[PDB]
Write a protein that binds this DNA or RNA. Structure first.
Lengths: 102, 46
RNA sequence: UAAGGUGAUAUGAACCGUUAUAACCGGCGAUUUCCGAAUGGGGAAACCCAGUGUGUUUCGACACACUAUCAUUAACUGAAUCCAUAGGUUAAUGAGGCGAACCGGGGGAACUGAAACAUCUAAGUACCCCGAGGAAAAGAAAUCAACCGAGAUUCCCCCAGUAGCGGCGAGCGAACGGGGAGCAGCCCAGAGCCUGAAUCAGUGUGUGUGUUAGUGGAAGCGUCUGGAAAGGCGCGCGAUACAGGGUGACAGCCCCGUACACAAAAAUGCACAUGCUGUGAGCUCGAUGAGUAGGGCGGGACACGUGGUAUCCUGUCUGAAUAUGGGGGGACCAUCCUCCAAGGCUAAAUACUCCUGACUGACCGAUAGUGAACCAGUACCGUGAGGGAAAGGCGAAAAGAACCCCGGCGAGGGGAGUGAAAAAGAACCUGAAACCGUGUACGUACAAGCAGUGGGAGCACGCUUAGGCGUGUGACUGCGUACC
RNA sequence: AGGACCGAACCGACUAAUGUUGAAAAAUUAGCGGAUGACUUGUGGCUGGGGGUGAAAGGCCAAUCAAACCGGGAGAUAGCU
RNA sequence: CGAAGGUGUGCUGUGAGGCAUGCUGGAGGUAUCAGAAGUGCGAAUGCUGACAUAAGUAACGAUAAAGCGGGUGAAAAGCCCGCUCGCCGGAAGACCAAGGGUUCCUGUCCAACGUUAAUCGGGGCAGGGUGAGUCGACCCCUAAGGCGAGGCCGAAAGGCG
């Protein structure tokens, strides 16, 4: 089952920057995701002028663990437990944190 | 000088070769014991 | 079931996307090169060479589908030889090879003990062989008891360290029978009556519930420290859910989950009900197995050894009785009880693992635990059976080495970047003993033994508020032949 | 003609020397010698554990052998160490 | 916001020990009282790993010996080119085979390898290369020997013919 998806903004519960949010760019088979503007890594890369010649460093994107990425509430600046339920095809939010428990 | 074993893949395949061993009860048992020890080769001539 | 996938090192192009084969998985059911049962024959670890029949064509060589062995069933053919049959051919079934451990049968020690050795013990072990089932094996009596009676066998605690056997040695070692696990008994030697009635398996279904593809399921925020917290604190809230595991330092409130609860293409276990097929509930009267039991001779198995040695297998010769008949009851005899052979079968309570599932260890942690956590039964040794290593852990994350330069457009390296840190640079955790460079102080170029222990000048160092404390070095001298 | 005299190829051990932690699992340098035989040899087979093979030393049987080698009974036994 | 491990220096008890305080670390620890042993290391002609000394001492694979000039290179006496010399010449040559296995060639590379120098190389790492009716094998027959039906011997592995 799903808990974040790529169509709306997420927030990172790991050691990452707590004042940033974004959408998922890509997902990996390792249980990891890439998110916009959160983190970047320097990457030097092999110069090899007759096979690469990269113009110095690459400064590239890096993946984070999918268990501790959560959906942004867009209401109180934080992550929230919301639930995913829909009658046809892709399951989308049903916002259980805005409804009474039974 | 001369060695008691001279190199020959013909006489090795005749004594210790896979089908040559398989065609005898005891050689087929050497092969069964190769599988028990887990030896990666069952023939060293081919 | 599901939106991210097209296995991984592996990226990119291309390619499904997100919408009725995306990937992934369950059911059943195809596809399955050559070696290999290997099944034409040959043979060699992945190779070689034929035949039978039909078709095609420059009738220069293509290329289907088939051909094993043994036993049985059928059909045609068929030698000496008429008929026949061996032999020959054709179609069909059965077997073949593989798979962990258990298991029936066969071959069968030595060591060891007897403080010495042969019988005896050890042992029907060890090892090898044959063969087979989901278990193998046993069974309801010519058995076992003791005048009381039992009423299958196996497995368990016992009976019992008793009987019996025993160089009357060393020691081997019961049965009867009790408590328990676990309880299915029948038929042929022969017919009817009864009516398909009890009970079990198989098979078309039904119902209840699991198994093989599942998704739902309550609560945690702020603030501080830190580069980063699952932490401290404030306290707040859930708990039939404080189990693992994962996530960036300790997660009941982040993720896969848990307690608690369901759902069904196809395949399928358990149990309740039912149809069908096969078996057939109950009543009654006959009838009781002759080449094998005895008997002489000899072995085997009996706890049991040549003894006064029964019994049951079994080699060989030989071979029986009828109710005032027969087997047995551990010599033999009688009396007596019990069974009545000479026909066939049997529940699983027991045994076990490659596998399936649940649970567990007062288990180890790179010389541990398996030799083997690591492209290990690899490298390597031997002609060969068969022997046989080294080697794990940067980091939270690949962010993994650009840029600035010396150099050979190098190795190697400084700076520098990444990062918490690379005094973490892949040769990477943090690392004591062993080993080797760096620096300072002392003794220091005329005297000979375990190199320590006392007494101790000079020099140099550190403590102390210092009041006979250590450290380094040491002239000279009292004592002094190590340790397992 | 030749179990003939000398002698290449071919074979090969007797003396001497070097080697001996080597180049070396037995060689090297020089010589004497075997060379139609009871010989030698290329290629493939066959002979196995108290069994082989031996003009026969208990020599040779893949360096091993008064009984080979590996794996098992086997962690057998040791009034001793 | 610094817990164990390892380890220094001081303190303290008849003693196995106990205690305070520094360095290293950054992850784990646990005061006390009751139950329980997988509970005390230097030796086993013991097992496995590490390192000194021996000692810069031995050796570099026989008894054919390459020289100089030029080159290439950061570097060369050993490589490429030139001239010259030497030894073997029944081998120190030519062809065939077993057995091995990418070794051939150009194109480069020089950490490791060839117990060196290495610019060379059967080394590293790439790229290219193995053209058959007639050659060696196969064909067809078959010796020694192996296998072996029907048949026989044997529990059987196995074996006779």
């Amino acid at each position: 089952a799903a808990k974040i998806r790529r169509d709306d903004e997420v927030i990172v519960l790991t050691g990452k920057d707590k004042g940033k949010r974004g959408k998922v760019k890509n997902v990996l088979s390792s249980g990891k995701v890439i998110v916009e503007g959160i983190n970047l890594v320097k990457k030097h890369q092999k110069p090899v002028p007759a096979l690469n010649q990269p113009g110095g460093i690459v400064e590239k994107e890096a993946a984070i663990q999918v268990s501790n990425v959560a959906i942004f509430n867009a209401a109180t600046g934080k992550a929230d437990r919301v639930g995913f339920r829909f009658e046809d095809g892709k399951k989308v939010r049903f916002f259980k944190s805005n409804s009474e428990t039974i | 000088m001369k060695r008691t074993f001279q190199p020959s893949v013909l006489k090795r395949n005749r004594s210790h070769g896979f089908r040559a061993r398989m065609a005898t009860k005891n050689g087929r048992q050497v092969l069964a014991r190769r599988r028990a020890k887990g030896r990666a080769r069952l023939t060293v001539s081919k």
